[PDB]
């Protein structure tokens, strides 16, 4: 059941160098007298690892919740075995299952449960002089446990219930690693007689257990036994004591290692391949010794930093202002059409104008048409009542749709409209606008009908002059300025887009970035797409030529669409790294050559040599570098 621990005086956690520590047997395979390469989660060599304390001098003890990352390397130098085990999980709060280890002299209890872990998880351990023993008085680790799914008891560990002193005579160290719902554990124990810290020498952890737990892990926390000694009040204001233990945490990560297995089937030495250039050389040769010489070992390669895209100036804008800002619009029965072709259409000036009362598009979203292309666009335009703007859409009906202007049911254009009673309304009405009130039949899509002859309303066969059942087919609108909004004039434009087998000629504008030079960049010049270093040029193309090619028929120059300048393209496709070694019998220092790159360091014909001094004194060649240049080990 849960309690708290006093919030405290403390110091920040320290760091220490891991040296060679934290190697473990990757596989249950016997291999003897052999060097084997493997890519696995390891603690990389010489890593700084966090050092934590558990000391009552004041009151600095350091068991936060910590990340698990890819996996944990843990170590302890021994005390009262103050570390009792660990909890691992995600939410820790019963609602997600978590793994508990507790490592008691009675039982190594291993449990997965819906543990409700505390504000401060610990074992309350009291010196029961009542019965001449220390004992746990209190499981202050959790409030409740439920749905456990797994439990195990292993044999009582090399760790004890009493206020003992291992006094750093032993180093206990572990790897914890969760993969595919299998929680692996590894460990080793080792006598030490250093003062403190991780020792230099090599050792391998053996497998300790694997638990098929399946549960989510993200975080962990170390569990401590806290000394409610008889001098303490036995409360949680101050009725506890921390002892004086120390523990270390490092993290695994993906690394390639080379392991030396001896005759007895034991790992005895290792190389972290990614550490330094000699480690990469040993890992390349699959050997722990390297003879005097030069070894090709890796490839250098530069990556593009930016993408530029660049297209000719935006200039030939389509005539929309001549349609929308026109002075005289048509009567709807005799609607105008204008045909738009061979231009850059910037629809943005339409679709985010605030002026229009209606704006909507069918088969196309405004979020796409500024990057779309068409053979032609038609703009149809006319004036109608505010009510009738409803009917200018697919599948509509009534006098305007059926006798004046019919859209296809599968239309792919836009309808735009705005109120006007300024251009096109005055006292007595402007009667200059008309519509068909009568026809024998409905229009087909985009039909027009200017025909002006008397509509015979069925009965009374009519000899071409108006009368009863025989009406003139057009009516004129009463566009008074004081009309209600449904009877105000509205100017309308319908933009119909189309595609045929003819090439596209109306298209949205193309954006250009700035033009950048002397960096490796990705680029797109007017559709010509690539990656390289752009620089000015001495080439002289003919006025119509756009890009150059070499004798191998690959692109080596280009013209800028917006300034007509010629640019050379050069590849950043470098290669080759080599390590120069006096032999490991002689020394562990090395020099490195980058095979052909503009940068001690020392540029040469054969690329830039790094890490060795150039010297004017000639000698015979110890190790050959490039173009009459050699390297040697000297005072």
């Amino acid at each position: 059941q849960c309690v708290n621990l006093t919030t405290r005086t403390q110091l920040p956690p320290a760091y220490t160098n891991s040296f060679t520590r934290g190697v473990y047997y990757p596989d249950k395979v016997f291999r003897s007298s052999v060097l084997h390469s493997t890519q696995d989660l390891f603690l990389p060599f010489f890593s700084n690892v966090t050092w934590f304390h558990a000391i009552h001098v004041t009151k600095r003890f350091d068991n936060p919740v910590l990340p698990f990352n890819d996996g944990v390397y843990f170590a302890s130098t021994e005390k009262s075995n103050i570390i009792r085990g660990w909890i691992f999980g995600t939410t820790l709060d019963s609602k997600t299952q978590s793994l508990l280890i507790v490592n008691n002299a009675t039982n190594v209890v291993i449990k997965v449960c819906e543990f409700q872990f505390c504000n401060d998880p610990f074992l309350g351990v009291y010196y029961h002089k009542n019965n001449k023993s220390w004992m746990e008085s209190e499981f202050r680790v959790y409030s409740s446990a439920n749905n456990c799914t797994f439990e195990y008891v292993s044999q009582p560990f090399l760790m004890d219930l009493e206020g003992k002193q291992g006094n750093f005579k032993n180093l206990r160290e572990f790897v914890f690693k969760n993969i595919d719902g299998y929680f692996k554990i590894y460990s080793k124990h080792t006598p030490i007689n250093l003062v403190r810290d991780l020792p230099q020498g090599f050792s391998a952890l053996e497998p300790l257990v694997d638990l098929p737990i399946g549960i989510n892990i993200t975080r962990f926390q170390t569990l401590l036994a806290l000394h409610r000694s008889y001098l303490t009040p036995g409360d949680s204001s101050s009725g506890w004591t921390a002892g004086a233990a120390a523990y270390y945490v490092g993290y695994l990560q993906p690394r390639t290692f080379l392991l030396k297995y001896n005759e007895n089937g034991t790992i005895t030495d290792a190389v972290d391949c990614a550490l330094d250039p000699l480690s990469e050389t040993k890992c390349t040769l699959k050997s722990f010794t390297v003879e005097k010489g030069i070894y090709q070992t890796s490839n250098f390669r530069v990556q593009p930093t930016e993408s530029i895209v660049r297209f000719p100036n935006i200039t030939n804008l389509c005539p929309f202002g001549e349609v929308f800002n026109a002075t005289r619009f048509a009567s709807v029965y005799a609607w105008n059409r204008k045909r738009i072709s061979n231009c850059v259409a910037d629809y943005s000036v339409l679709y985010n104008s605030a002026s229009f009362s209606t704006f909507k598009c069918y088969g196309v979203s405004p979020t796409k048409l500024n990057d779309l292309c068409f053979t032609n666009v038609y703009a149809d335009s006319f004036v109608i009542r505010g009510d009738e703007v409803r009917q200018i859409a697919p599948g509509q009906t009534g006098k305007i749709a059926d006798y004046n202007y019919k859209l296809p049911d599968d239309f792919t254009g836009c309808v735009i409209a705005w109120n006007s009673n300024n251009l096109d309304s005055k006292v007595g009405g402007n009667y200059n606008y008309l519509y068909r009130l009568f026809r024998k039949s409905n229009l087909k899509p985009f039909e027009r009908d200017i025909s002006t002859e008397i509509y015979q309303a069925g009965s009374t066969p009519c000899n071409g002059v108006e009368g009863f059942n025989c009406y003139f087919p057009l009516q004129s609108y009463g566009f008074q300025p004081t009309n209600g909004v449904g009877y105000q004039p509205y100017r309308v434009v319908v933009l119909s887009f189309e595609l045929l087998h003819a090439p596209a000629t109306v298209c949205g504008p193309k954006k250009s970035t700035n033009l950048v030079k002397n960096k490796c960049v990705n680029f797109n010049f007017n559709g010509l797409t690539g990656t390289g270093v752009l620089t000015e040029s001495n080439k002289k193309f003919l006025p119509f030529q756009q890009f150059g090619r070499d004798i191998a028929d690959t692109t080596d120059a280009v013209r800028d669409p917006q300034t007509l300048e010629i640019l050379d393209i050069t590849p950043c496709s470098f290669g080759g790294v080599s390590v120069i070694t006096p032999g490991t019998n002689t020394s562990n220092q090395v020099a490195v050559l980058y095979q052909d790159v503009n940068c001690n360091v020392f540029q040469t014909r054969a690329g830039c040599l790094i890490g060795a001094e150039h010297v004017n004194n000639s000698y015979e060649c110890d190790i050959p570098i490039g173009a009459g240049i050699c390297a040697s080990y000297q005072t």
């Epitope: 679709y351 985010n352 209606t358 704006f359 909507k360 979203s365 405004p366």
Partner: antibody, heavy 118, light 111 residues
């Protein structure tokens, strides 16, 4: 992709001035409509006002009298001031993007609570 | 000026289908695009219909928009209700340099 993160003074008292900032990651102010919307506790959304593409401003006539909205492109940040606050200004406030004048509220800031209390 | 109105609440049993109406008033709803946002409690809204018929990427095809100028109304149909559909739904549209929202409808799936 684009993120909006917002912050400001969540607790006020009557007749003070409210002030929020919203800042954009992975995107740029210039091309889009940027807008403030509020939601009183257990009530429908109310649109306050907006910046258009290129940074001119438009406000709801019911709040026009006591609202101000402004950008600093050097921070990728924009902001709302609402003066003379009363209990009725208690709400959650969101910033949001719109691609074009009549288009959707495309992406939203995480929302921030404001309590105006004496 | 122009207002969208919605029923305050809607409910039906899971696996069934419902319509939420959004009625235009003082102007014509068909004249500009309509959007529907879902807000699940304690979070920012999200779009489910982004022009009168159009459904965003990743939105279940259970969600389906519609409009008619004859009722002066839009409506959202959710077909095959699930536990996760229980939320507020707001319609929205541009009017006259103003974005207008409906009052929002609570949908519950009738467990």
């Amino acid at each position: 992709q684009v993120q909006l993160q917002q912050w400001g003074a969540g607790l006020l008292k009557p007749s003070e001035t409210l002030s929020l900032t919203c800042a954009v990651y992975g995107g740029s102010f210039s091309g889009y409509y940027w807008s403030w919307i509020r939601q009183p506790p257990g009530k429908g959304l109310e649109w306050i006002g907006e910046i258009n593409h290129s940074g001119s401003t438009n406000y709801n006539p019911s709040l026009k009298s006591r609202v101000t909205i402004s950008v600093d492109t050097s921070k990728n940040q924009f902001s709302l001031k609402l003066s003379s606050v009363t209990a009725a200004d208690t709400a959650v406030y969101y910033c949001a993007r719109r691609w074009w004048l009549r288009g959707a509220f495309d992406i939203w800031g995480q929302g921030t609570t404001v309590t105006v209390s004496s | 000026n122009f207002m969208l109105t919605q029923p305050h609440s809607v409910s039906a049993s899971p696996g069934k289908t419902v319509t939420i109406p959004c009625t235009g008033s003082s102007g014509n709803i068909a004249s500009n695009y309509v959007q529907w946002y879902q807000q699940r409690p304690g979070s920012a809204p999200t779009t489910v219909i982004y022009e009168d018929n159009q459904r965003p990427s990743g939105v279940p095809d259970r969600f389906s928009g519609s409009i008619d100028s004859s009722s002066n109304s839009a409506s959202l149909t959710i077909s095959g209700l699930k536990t996760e559909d229980e939320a507020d739904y707001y319609c929205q549209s541009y009017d006259n340099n103003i974005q207008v929202f409906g009052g929002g409808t609570k949908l519950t799936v009738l467990g």
